[PDB]
Curated annotation (Swiss-Prot):
The gene is selB. It is found in: Cytoplasm. It comes from Moorella thermoacetica (Clostridium thermoaceticum). The lineage of its organism: Bacteria, Bacillati, Bacillota, Clostridia, Moorellales. This is Selenocysteine-specific elongation factor. Belongs to the TRAFAC class translation factor GTPase superfamily. Classic translation factor GTPase family. SelB subfamily. Translation factor necessary for the incorporation of selenocysteine into proteins. It probably replaces EF-Tu for the insertion of selenocysteine directed by the UGA codon. SelB binds GTP and GDP. The chain holds residues 377 to 511 of 634 of the full protein.
Length: 135
């Protein structure tokens, strides 16, 4: 198939996403070409781009959106069941839905969702934005 189809399949099939350089290598593409294709896939709403430390990851947008829907439901349910607790253990959420991700990528996702106003983070726990303990 064409180089663009090869790259698209690499990213869309990848269950955690991957360093864009790794994707370039797997597709036998230059960085230039990989970047330009990623920019059009991002414009089409197909790929999510995430900096992780000094690396850049390309992730299927469908996968990323499905992660968020799992997280918000789990936290909604947790806050309903246990409204006095400050949040769910970060490591428990990781083990539920993110066990194949590198830990640093999981942390970058939590920090992104917090920045966006979706979450609030403590050192060990995670909660929905605006949640406060009560009875
Ligand atoms: Cl990778
Ligand atoms: Cl290159
Ligand atoms: Cl989302
Ligand atoms: Cl996983
Ligand atoms: Na992004
Ligand atoms: Na790097």
């Amino acid at each position: 198939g064409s180089p663009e189809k090869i790259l698209a399949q690499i990213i869309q099939e990848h269950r955690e996403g991957l360093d864009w350089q790794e994707a370039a290598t797997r597709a036998s593409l230059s960085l230039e070409e990989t970047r330009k294709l990623l920019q059009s896939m991002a414009a089409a709403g197909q790929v999510t781009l995430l900096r992780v430390e000094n690396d850049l990851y390309a992730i299927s947008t469908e996968r990323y959106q499905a992660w968020w829907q799992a997280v918000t439901r789990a936290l909604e349910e947790f806050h309903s069941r246990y409204p006095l607790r400050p949040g769910l253990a970060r490591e428990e959420l990781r083990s539920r839905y993110f066990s194949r991700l590198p830990a640093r990528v999981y942390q970058a996702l939590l920090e992104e969702w917090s920045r966006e106003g979706r979450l609030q983070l403590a050192a060990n726990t995670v909660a929905l934005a605006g949640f406060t303990p009560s009875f």
